[PDB]
Amino acid sequence: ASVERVYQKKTQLEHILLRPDTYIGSVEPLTQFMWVYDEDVGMNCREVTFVPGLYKIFDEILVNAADNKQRDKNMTCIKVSIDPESNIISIWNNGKGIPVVEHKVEKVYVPALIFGQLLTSSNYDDDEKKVTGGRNGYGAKLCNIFSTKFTVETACKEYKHSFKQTWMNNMMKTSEAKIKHFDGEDYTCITFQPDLSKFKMEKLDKDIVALMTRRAYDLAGSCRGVKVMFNGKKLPVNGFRSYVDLYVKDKLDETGVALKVIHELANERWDVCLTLSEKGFQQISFVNSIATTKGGRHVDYVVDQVVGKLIEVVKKKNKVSVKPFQVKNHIWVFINCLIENPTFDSQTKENMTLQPKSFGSKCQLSEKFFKAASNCGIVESILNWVKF
Amino acid sequence: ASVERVYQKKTQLEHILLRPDTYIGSVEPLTQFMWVYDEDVGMNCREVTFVPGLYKIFDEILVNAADNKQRDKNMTCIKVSIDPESNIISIWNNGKGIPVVEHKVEKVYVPALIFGQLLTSSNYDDDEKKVTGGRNGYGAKLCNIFSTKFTVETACKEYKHSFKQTWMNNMMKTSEAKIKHFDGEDYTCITFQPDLSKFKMEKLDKDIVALMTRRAYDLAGSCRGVKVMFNGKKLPVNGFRSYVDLYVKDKLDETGVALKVIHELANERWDVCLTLSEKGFQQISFVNSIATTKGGRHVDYVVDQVVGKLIEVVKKKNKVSVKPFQVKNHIWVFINCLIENPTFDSQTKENMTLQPKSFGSKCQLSEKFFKAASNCGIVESILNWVKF
Ligand SMILES: Nc1ncnc2c1ncn2[C@@H]1O[C@H](COP(=O)(O)OP(=O)(O)NP(=O)(O)O)[C@@H](O)[C@H]1O
Ligand SMILES: Nc1ncnc2c1ncn2[C@@H]1O[C@H](COP(=O)(O)OP(=O)(O)NP(=O)(O)O)[C@@H](O)[C@H]1O
Ligand SMILES: CCCc1cc(=O)oc2c(C(=O)N3CCCc4ccccc43)c(OCCO)ccc12
Ligand SMILES: CCCc1cc(=O)oc2c(C(=O)N3CCCc4ccccc43)c(OCCO)ccc12
Ligand SMILES: [Mg+2]
Ligand SMILES: [Mg+2]
C-alpha cells in the first residue's frame, strides 16, 4: 500500500456514511429487553430486535417537532404517520413554520440551509438559555443522509409563503424548491423514506414500528401542552402522570400487592414518579423530550436525594451497614425534566452530562414526597435484608 | 433577532470549540469515585475531581502510541512524561516512525496532514481487520485544538528524514516544519501544553495527574509486549495478570478472607480475571488499549457466560428464583481484549457497541475457569441469599 492509500482524508459527508456510529448509533441489529408499544398488547417490556441508527433518524425528526414548542408556545399538536408498506414516515407539527426567505449570508432559502447543509442550527447561541433538545446542528441532515427520499414542507404566514423541497439518494440529489403564496395556519411536515439498505433491512418490521410508536407516547407524556396523534388517532395520554400509568397502573410486586406509585411535580421543569423495583435499579427519563436511555446527571440528582432520605429512614430502624447501591437496587424512577443548554457525550443523546449547578432550576423534593417514598416498599425490602 | 442571527452555520473547527462534549467529553469538572494512581498510596479508589475533556486529549495521544504496535510489531516502549510546573506532557514511542514525505494527493507532508487537518487517518479502510483503537481520524487533532502548543516529532529511517513541526493557539498557528537527515532508530514524540483555560483550570493538579498516571499503568497491563515508563521510571507491570494484582492482591472480602481471583488467557486476544464484588457489579475493561469505562458488548459477552454457568451451579443447590441481575451484582470482572474494527457511540469510546459475531475472535471460557468461578464466593453469596 502506498502512502496515499494508507493515509486518507475524508469529507464530513463521507465520514458520516463510513462512521455512522458516532452520529446515529449502530447500523447493525441489536437485541435489547426494553419497552415498546405493540399492536396486540400496548405498552409492554420484551426483547426487541432493531437497528439503533434507524430509531435515531426518526427520533431526530420527532424531537425537532417537540422543539418547535419552544419557538412558538402556541403550538398544540404533533402528528406521526408510519406506513411500512410504502416505507413512508411523516412527522407534522403546528405552530410557527420556518421563515420562507433567502438567508442573506448563506444565499439559500432558510429551510434548504438547515435541512440540507451540515452544522446548521438555531441552537448555537447559548446566551439564550433554551430547553430545546437540539444542540448540534446535525439531526435533520442525518435523517436526510440516511433516507432515499426526504421532503421538507413548511408554511410561514409571517413571510406569506410556503416551501416544499425534496432530497433523494442520501441527500446527494435535490431540485428547485416550490415556493407558493401562503396565508393560512403555519405548519411543518417532514416526510421521509428511510434507506433500509443502510440498516440491512427489507422493511419497517413490527419491532421498529413498536419502538417508534412508543416514542410518540413518550412525547405525549413529556411535551407539555402538545397533543400527539399516531396514524390518525389521538394518543390518550395527557401529561406525565398518565404516561407513567402505562407502566405501573396494572403491576403487582412479587408478593401480589399493587405497586405504590408516588408523584411530585416539584416545579414546571421537574416531574418525578417513584415506585419499588424488584429487578434492580430502573430509570425512565426524558430531558427536553429526549429519551435519556443511559441516564445522566439529572437521574443521579433525583435518585441521590431519595437514597439519602431512605438511608435515614432505614437507620432509624437498623440498630448493619446499608450502602447506597443497595437502596438504588430497589428504585424504579420516572423523570421528565427541562434543562437549559444540556450537554451529552454523543449525538444520540442517551446520557446527559451537564452538572446540576448548570441546570437552570432545582428539583428539591418535598418532605411529603419523602414520607410517601418511605411507604412504597423500598424501606421494607431493605429492612428485610438487614436480617441477612 | 434577524434570520441571519437565528439560523447559523458553523465550520467543523468552530463546532469543536462550541460543542466539545461530543468530541472530548465534558469541559466542566466532574467528581467520580474511581481508581487513580497517587504519589502517596499508589493504586486506590477514591473520589476524584477532574475535567473529562482534559483526560481525553491525553488519552487520544496515549492510545495512538499503543496503536503503533500494530503498524510495527517490533515496537517495545512507550515513555510518558508529565511536568505540572511547566505544563508540558510528552508521549514517546519507538517502532516505525511516520513517513517524512509529501502526500501526493494532499500536497503536504504526511505528519502535517494527519496531525493538523481534521478527518485524516490510516484507519479508514475496514477491509483491513485491525485491532487498533483509532477509527475516526480526529483524536490527535482534538489534542492539538485543545493545546496552546503541540509539537510533533517523528523520524523514519525508510524515508531517511526526521520531521518536527509545532502548532500553537488551538491549532490556529504553525510554521514550516524542520526536515533533517535521519538514519537512526525510529521514534515518534508528541509534546503538548494543554490549554487549561478551555477546562477552567489553573494547573495540572494532583487528581488529573493521578488519573493520567493510572492510564500509563493501564497501558503497561493492556498492550502486549510494550514496556511503559512514567517520568523516567519503568512501570513494574509486565502483563494483564500483574496489572489486575494492583487492584485485588491485598483485598479482603467483608468477612476478612482474601479475594479469590480466577484468570484465563482464553487466546491471544482475550484475557479475563474474575473475583467477588460486595458493592454491586464492577467491570474494568480495555478494548485495543482503550479504557471502556461504560463497558460494552465485550463485557456483556464475557459476563453472560459466567452468569449462565453460575446460575446452573446455584440451581443444583437451590431446591427460589435467582435472576441474572442478582448474580451480576456479585461479579467483579477484568477484561483485556483485541477487537477487529470496533464501534463506539462516541469519539470518547467509553462504550464499545460492536456485536460479538463481528469481534473477529471468540472467548469461550473453559470448564476449568467456570469450576474455579464457582469457588470464588459468588455462589456462596447467592445461596446465602436464597435463605431470604
Ligand atoms: N419541525 C421544525 N419546526 C421548526 N424548525 C425546525 C423544525 N425541525 C427543524 N427545525 C430547524 O432546523 C434546524 C436544524 O435541525 P437539526 O439539524 O435537527 O439541528 P438542531 O435540532 O438545532 N440540533 P441537533 O438535533 O442536536 O443536531 C433546527 O435548529 C431548527 O431551527
Ligand atoms: N504515535 C504515532 N505513531 C505513528 N503514527 C501515528 C501516531 N499517532 C498518530 N499516528 C497516525 O496519525 C493518524 C491520525 O491520528 P488520530 O487523529 O488519532 O486518528 P486515528 O487514531 O486514526 N482515529 P481516532 O483516534 O479514533 O480519531 C493515525 O491514523 C496514525 O496513522
Ligand atoms: C439504543 C436505543 C436504546 C433505547 C431506546 C428507547 O427508546 O428506549 C429504551 C428503553 C426504554 O424502553 N425506555 C422506555 C421510555 C424511554 C426511556 C427513557 C430512558 C430509559 C428507558 C426508556 C430501555 O429500557 C430498558 C428497560 O428499562 C433501554 C434502551 C432503550
Ligand atoms: C469520563 C472518564 C471516566 C473514567 C476514566 C477512567 O480512566 O477510569 C474510570 C474508572 C476507572 O477507574 N477504571 C480503572 C481502569 C480503567 C477502567 C476501565 C473500565 C472501567 C473502569 C476503569 C471508573 O471506575 C469506576 C469504579 O470502577 C469510572 C470512570 C472512569
Ligand atoms: Mg434536532
Ligand atoms: Mg487516534
DSSP string, A99-139: --SB-TTT-SBHHHHHHHSSSEES---TTS----S--SS-H
- The class of domain A262-385 in CATH terms is alpha beta
CA of B134 to the centre of ligand 2 (A): 6
Q: How far is B255 from chain A (nearest CA, A)?
A: 13
Residue A264 CB contacts under 8 Å (≥ 6 apart), including other chains: A271, A272, A365, A366, A368, A369
Q: How far apart, in whole angstroms, are the C-alpha atoms of residue B118 and residue B104?
A: 18
Q: Where in chain A is the domain with CATH 3.30.230.10?
A: 262-385
Q: How far apart, in whole angstroms, are the C-alpha atoms of residue B334 and residue B249?
A: 14
Say how many Å lie between the first and final Cα of chain A, rounded: 65
Residues A65/A91, Cβ–Cβ less than 8 Å: yes
Q: How far apart, in whole angstroms, are the C-alpha atoms of residue B20 and residue B23?
A: 5
The strand pairing partners of B332, in sequence order, are B275, B282
The strand pairing partners of A147, in sequence order, are A194
- Does residue A52 have its Cβ closer than 6 Å to ligand 3? yes
A93 is known to lie in a ligand binding site: yes
DSSP assignment letter at A7: S
Residues of A whose CB is below 8 A from B354: 26, 28
Residues B287/B298, Cβ–Cβ less than 8 Å: yes
Does A8 contact B121 at a Cβ distance shorter than 8 Å?
yes
B121 is known to lie in a ligand binding site: yes
The amino acid at residue B359 is: F
Q: Which ligand is nearest to the CA of B144?
A: 2
CA of A381 to the centre of ligand 1 (A): 46
User: H or E segment at B283?
Assistant: strand B282-287
CA of A146 to the centre of ligand 5 (A): 15
Query: In Å, how far are A46, A336, B4 from A273, measured between CA atoms?
Result: 22, 9, 42
Residues A151/A165, Cβ–Cβ less than 8 Å: yes
Residue A130 CB contacts under 8 Å (≥ 6 apart), including other chains: A70, A123, A340, A341
Does B12 contact A119 at a Cβ distance shorter than 8 Å?
yes
3-state helix/strand/coil string of A193-225: EECHHHHCCCCCCHHHHHHHHHHHHHHHHHCCC
φ/ψ bin of A258: left (φ > 0), alpha (ψ from -120 to 50), beta (otherwise): beta
Q: How far is A171 from chain B (nearest CA, A)?
A: 18
Beta strands in B87-235 (DSSP E): 88-94, 120-121, 147-156, 161-168, 173-174, 178-181, 187-194, 227-230, 233-234
In a mutagenesis test of the B interface, which of A8, A108, A128 is the best target, namely the one with the most B β-carbons within 10 Å?
A8
3-state class of B91 per DSSP?
Answer: strand
Residues A70/A223, Cβ–Cβ less than 8 Å: no
Residues of A whose CB is below 8 A from B277: none
Measured in degrees and rounded to the nearest 5, phi and psi for residue A386 equal -75, -5
Q: How far apart, in whole angstroms, are the C-alpha atoms of residue B349 and residue A346?
A: 10
Q: Which CATH number does the domain B260-385 belong to among 3.30.230.10, 3.30.360.10, 3.40.50.970, 3.40.50.300?
A: 3.30.230.10
Handedness of CA A334, A337, A343, A348 (dihedral sign): positive
Residues A181/A161, Cβ–Cβ less than 8 Å: yes
CA of A172 to the centre of ligand 5 (A): 20
Where do we find the cell 433554551?
A130
Long-range contacts of A9-15 (CB under 8 A, 24+ apart): A9/B105, A9/B106, A9/B113, A9/B117, A9/B119, A9/B120, A9/B137, A10/B119, A10/B120, A10/B121, A10/B124, A10/B137, A11/B119, A12/A118, A12/A119, A12/B12, A12/B119, A13/A118, A13/A145, A13/A171, A15/B119, A15/B136, A15/B137
Resolution of the solved structure (Å): 1.5
Does B346 contact A343 at a Cβ distance shorter than 8 Å?
no
A144 is known to lie in a ligand binding site: no
Burial (Cβ within 10 Å: 0-12, 13-18, ≥19) of residue B59: buried
Query: In Å, how far are A27, A193, A215, B224 from A66, measured between CA atoms?
Result: 25, 21, 12, 50
Measured in degrees and rounded to the nearest 5, phi and psi for residue A144 equal -60, -50
Q: How far apart, in whole angstroms, are the C-alpha atoms of residue A355 and residue A342?
A: 9
Residue A217 CB contacts under 8 Å (≥ 6 apart), including other chains: A37, A43, A228, A230, A235, A237, A243, A246
Residues A352/A340, Cβ–Cβ less than 8 Å: no
Residues of A whose CB is below 8 A from B382: none
User: H or E segment at B274?
Assistant: strand B270-276
Q: How far apart, in whole angstroms, are the C-alpha atoms of residue A364 and residue A28?
A: 41
Beta strands in chain A (DSSP E): 8-9, 30-38, 42-50, 77-83, 88-94, 120-121, 147-156, 161-168, 173-174, 178-181, 187-194, 227-230, 233-234, 262-267, 270-276, 282-287, 290-291, 295-296, 331-337, 351-352
Structure method: X-ray
Question: Which three cell numbers, joined as nine digits, stand for B219?
Answer: 497501558
Of the candidates B152, B344, B17, the one whose C-alpha atom is nearest the C-alpha of residue A52 is B344
Residues A46/A206, Cβ–Cβ less than 8 Å: no
- Does residue A281 have its Cβ closer than 6 Å to ligand 3? no
Neighbours of ion ligand 5 (CB under 5 A): A 64, 134, 139
Residues of B whose CB is below 8 A from A307: none
Residues of B whose CB is below 8 A from A25: 345, 353
3-state class of B84 per DSSP?
Answer: coil
Radius of gyration of chain B (CA): 23
Other C-beta atoms closer than 10 Å to the C-beta of A233 total 8
Residues comprising chain B, all counted: 388
Query: In Å, how far are A158, B36, B77, B326 from B82, measured between CA atoms?
Result: 59, 15, 17, 42
User: H or E segment at B317?
Assistant: none
Of the candidates B372, B357, B294, the one whose C-alpha atom is nearest the C-alpha of residue B32 is B294
Q: Where in chain B is the domain with CATH 3.30.230.10?
A: 260-385
Residues B189/B153, Cβ–Cβ less than 8 Å: yes
User: How many H-runs (helices) and E-runs (strands) does chain B carry?
Assistant: 12, 20
In a mutagenesis test of the B interface, which of A7, A15, A115 is the best target, namely the one with the most B β-carbons within 10 Å?
A7
Burial (Cβ within 10 Å: 0-12, 13-18, ≥19) of residue A35: middle
Q: How far apart, in whole angstroms, are the C-alpha atoms of residue A16 and residue A10?
A: 10
| Ligand 2 surroundings by CB, under 6 angstroms | B 60, 64-65, 68, 93, 98, 114, 120-123, 134-141, 188
Q: Name which of B5, B103, B114 is nearest A4 (Cβ-Cβ).
A: B103
Q: Which residue of A has its CA nearest to B136?
A: A19
3-state class of B180 per DSSP?
Answer: strand
DSSP assignment letter at A160: T
Residues A3/B103, Cβ–Cβ less than 8 Å: yes
Q: Where in chain B is the domain with CATH 3.30.565.10?
A: 30-240
Q: How far apart, in whole angstroms, are the C-alpha atoms of residue B161 and residue B145?
A: 26
Does A344 contact B22 at a Cβ distance shorter than 8 Å?
yes
Residues comprising chain A, all counted: 388
Q: Find out if CATH 3.90.1150.10 is the number for domain B30-240.
A: no
Question: Which three cell numbers, joined as nine digits, stand for A296?
Answer: 445522566
Q: How far is A358 from chain B (nearest CA, A)?
A: 10
A258 is known to lie in a ligand binding site: no
Q: How far apart, in whole angstroms, are the C-alpha atoms of residue A160 and residue A174?
A: 24
Query: In Å, how far are B151, B197, B199 from B147, measured between CA atoms?
Result: 10, 10, 11
